[PDB]
């Protein structure tokens, strides 16, 4: 009698969706709020860190911004233990394609290989599926800039602007009315900054606790250049926007 569902995750839940995935969604809401925006001139990525006060040095250490390549970039919102495994794994798969084919790996193929890892845990064995959500920002020579979202269920969908954490549906509403096809790099910086302030309980969002990164097409020869903005440069962003 019974003696099931307590070990292997292959047994389906009474609702048809595994309760382990539902509990992973709650861990995503406990993390920060990362809002990506896909545009023709680049992709803007910004998030608010969990650590606080004055004790932790927030200038050097960034857990929500990781660079896979000079084009593809990821935004980590979720559990760090499950995220670190795919960080080195994606770097291996991206360099193997660059080793074998000598080309930049597309986001659709790269995420598909990473999506099967989260799916393989719910497929074979009772291993824990990754409940961390990745925001994939990359550029290709065919479809241009591609922006997807990694769900703990193991799938991914295309998104122009996606938000995680608290107020997920509320952030997508503010970005819809402010969405523009002619939006430049600077136009996406201010609207993403004002939306993040309203969707979070902390309106302060200093320079150290907030991480800001933007891929720009206006570099030399139109090449993709990823510039990591230090908190010293983030402080100047609040002066231009007039919030702080």
């Amino acid at each position: 009698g019974s003696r099931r569902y307590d070990s292997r995750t292959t047994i389906f839940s009474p609702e048809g969706r595994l309760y382990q995935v539902e509990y992973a969604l709650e861990s995503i809401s406990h993390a920060g709020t990362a809002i990506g925006i896909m545009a023709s001139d680049g992709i803007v990525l910004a998030a608010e860190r969990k650590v606080t006060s004055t004790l932790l040095e927030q200038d050097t250490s960034t857990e929500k911004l990781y660079k896979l390549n000079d084009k593809i970039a990821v935004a980590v919102a979720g559990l760090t233990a499950d995220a670190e495994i795919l960080i080195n794994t994606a770097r291996i798969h991206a360099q193997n394609y660059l080793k074998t084919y000598n080309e930049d790996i597309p986001v659709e193929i790269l995420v598909r290989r990473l999506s099967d890892i989260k799916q393989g845990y719910t497929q074979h064995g009772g291993l824990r599926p990754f409940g961390v959500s990745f925001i994939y920002a990359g550029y290709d020579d065919r479809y241009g800039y591609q922006l997807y979202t990694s769900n703990p269920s193991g799938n991914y969908t295309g998104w122009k602007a996606i938000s995680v954490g608290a107020n997920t549906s509320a952030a997508q509403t503010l970005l819809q009315m402010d969405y523009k096809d002619d939006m430049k790099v600077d136009d996406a910086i201010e609207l993403a900054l004002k939306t993040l302030s309203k969707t979070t309980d902390s309106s302060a969002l200093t320079y150290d606790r907030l991480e800001f990164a933007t891929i720009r097409k206006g570099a030399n020869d139109g090449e993709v250049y990823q510039k990591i903005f230090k908190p010293q440069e983030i402080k100047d962003i609040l002066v231009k926007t007039g919030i702080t």
């Binding site: 659709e108 193929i109 598909r112 020579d141």
Partner: protein, 195 residues
């Protein structure tokens, strides 16, 4: 033996593969296709030991076609030679060495320019305006450099090939019973049965 020669003209890429396949002494068949079509914009031949090159270009074509369906985009010819070199690098280091040469060329739709890559049995990627294999290439290397120019059209490259093949069969006793020429341009693969 098994002559495969190719040259990149201005508006297209001219590739020629041998017809007759001689097994041992006697000639078993005088007409055979020594090349494989990867994508409509890319043509690749194979020559080497009997039976190793036939099976080699098959699963390579299956992997390229499989990777193209996943991305809904045709693999660029420049990345094709990189994937072939990766397999040929592991073949010489495995327990069974595989000596396979390929001529990888086509028309890139992104840059709107043709490209031709020459790869020997060692599996080295080399881009040249003309290429050949076997003992027949030794005669055509100095001849094409003295005559062919980057401004030569496709029609002149066909008549120039007739002069080369005529000298290859006259000087060397081997007879391949003609070559199969397939023009690779923006319009796709175009076969030529006049040869």
């Amino acid at each position: 033996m098994d002559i495969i020669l190719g040259i990149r003209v201005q508006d297209s890429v001219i590739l020629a593969s041998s017809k007759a396949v001689t097994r041992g002494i006697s000639v078993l068949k005088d007409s055979d296709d020594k090349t494989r079509q990867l994508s409509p914009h890319t043509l690749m031949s194979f020559a080497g030991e009997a039976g190793d090159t036939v099976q080699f270009a098959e699963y390579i074509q299956a992997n390229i076609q499989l990777y193209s369906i996943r991305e809904d985009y045709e693999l660029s010819p420049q990345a094709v030679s990189s994937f072939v070199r990766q397999e040929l690098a592991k073949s010489i280091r495995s327990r069974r060495p595989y000596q396979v040469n390929v001529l990888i060329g086509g028309y890139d739709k992104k840059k709107n320019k043709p490209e031709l890559y020459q790869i020997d049995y060692l599996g080295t990627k080399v881009e040249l305006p003309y290429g050949a294999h076997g003992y027949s290439g030794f005669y055509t290397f100095s001849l094409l450099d003295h005559h062919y120019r980057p401004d030569m059209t496709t029609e002149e490259g066909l008549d120039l090939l007739k002069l080369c093949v005529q000298e290859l069969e006259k000087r060397m006793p081997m007879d391949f019973k003609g070559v199969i020429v397939k023009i690779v341009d923006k319009d796709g693969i175009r076969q030529v049965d006049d040869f």
